[PDB]
Amino acid sequence: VKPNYALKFTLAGHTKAVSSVKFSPNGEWLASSSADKLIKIWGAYDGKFEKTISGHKLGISDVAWSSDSNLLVSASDDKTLKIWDVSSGKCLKTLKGHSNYVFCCNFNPQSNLIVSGSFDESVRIWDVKTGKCLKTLPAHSDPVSAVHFNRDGSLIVSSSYDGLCRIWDTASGQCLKTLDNPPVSFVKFSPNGKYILAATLDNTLKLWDYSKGKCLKTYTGHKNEKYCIFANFSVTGGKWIVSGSEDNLVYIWNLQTKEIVQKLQGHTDVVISTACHPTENIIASAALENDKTIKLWKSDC
Ligand SMILES: CC(=O)NCCCCc1nc(CO)c[nH]1
Numbered sequence: 001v002k003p004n005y006a007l008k009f010t011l012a013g014h015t016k017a018v019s020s021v022k023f024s025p026n027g028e029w030l031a032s033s034s035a036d037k038l039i040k041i042w043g044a045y046d047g048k049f050e051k052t053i054s055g056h057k058l059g060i061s062d063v064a065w066s067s068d069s070n071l072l073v074s075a076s077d078d079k080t081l082k083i084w085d086v087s088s089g090k091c092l093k094t095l096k097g098h099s100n101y102v103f104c105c106n107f108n109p110q111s112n113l114i115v116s117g118s119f120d121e122s123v124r125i126w127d128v129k130t131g132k133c134l135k136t137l138p139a140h141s142d143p144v145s146a147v148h149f150n151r152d153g154s155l156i157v158s159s160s161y162d163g164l165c166r167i168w169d170t171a172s173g174q175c176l177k178t179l180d181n182p183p184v185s186f187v188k189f190s191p192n193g194k195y196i197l198a199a200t201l202d203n204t205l206k207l208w209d210y211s212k213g214k215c216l217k218t219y220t221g222h223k224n225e226k227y228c229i230f231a232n233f234s235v236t237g238g239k240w241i242v243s244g245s246e247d248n249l250v251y252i253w254n255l256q257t258k259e260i261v262q263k264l265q266g267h268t269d270v271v272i273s274t275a276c277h278p279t280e281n282i283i284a285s286a287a288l289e290n291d292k293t294i295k296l297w298k299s300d301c
């Protein structure tokens with residue numbers, strides 16, 4: 001069995017590289033962030049442009065949704081994160097404390113906390129209500145490429161150009177585990193929180209068993225030597241691994257067999273970001289500044 005993702009919509013409007021696309025947990029919306037300093041909201045099902053959210057003074061590297069689909073958080077080169085009310089487009093809080101570009105961000109499942117990763121080599125944990133920094137983790141010895149909460153928010157996983165993935169106890173900020181050392185460009189937990197998916201800048205994705213601390217699966221064939229490209233667990237139909245690539249394609253692998261099952265063609269630059277819809281067999285992909293578009297794809301499985 002293989003998926004049959006086909007192009008449904010091309011979403012134009014960003015004037016520089018797209019950096020990140022994310023579906024709202026309720027499946028209604030796609031949010032995109034860009035080097036153009038803007039967040040854009042789009043209909044997940046009709047691709048219809050909804051609104052622009054503005055206020056960052058420099059480019060945005062990442063955006064993430066609260067669990068109720070009402071709030072966004074953005075990570076910017078202006079060294080801040082901003083918490084946004086999606087309905088009003090208003091900036092509710094500016095999260096200050098990082099000393100360099102903020103690269104990655106995520107809410108916990110409760111959405112009382114935000115985790116951030118920065119070029120300043122720290123991971124910060126923030127109170128959503130107050131906008132205050134609760135904890136600063138001296139997490140890494142190079143820029144932090146990704147941060148992600150597990151299923152209940154009890155753990156954070158971080159990755160860095162220093163070649164490490166680290167698992168952190170959210171409550172205490174203490175490191176529970178460190179996983180050659182090529183730069184780690186992306187990491188996230190599996191939906192069940194038992195596994196970690198990690199990208200390294202040697203054109204390799206690895207599935208790690210967190211409990212055992214050992215590599216279970218490797219996914220190759222794509223190009224990733226430069227950019228922090230997002231990767232995804234696709235779980236709505238077949239059990240796939242999804243990633244962008246520096247050869248301008250979306251790669252889809254069989255999680256169990258590690259075989260490439262589809263390559264999506266259409267982008268005219270690096271596919272930096274992919275997202276999987278929470279309920280439908282729908283992928284969003286976004287590309288860098290030769291392309292600047294988002295594409296919505298639909299599969300029967
Ligand atoms: C250096 C690089 O990859 N620049 C392209 C724009 C940033 C993309 C991005 N990836 C992540 C992974 O967590 C967050 N943001």
Ligand SMILES: [Cl-]
Nearest residue numbers: 232274275276
């Ligand atoms: Cl996703």
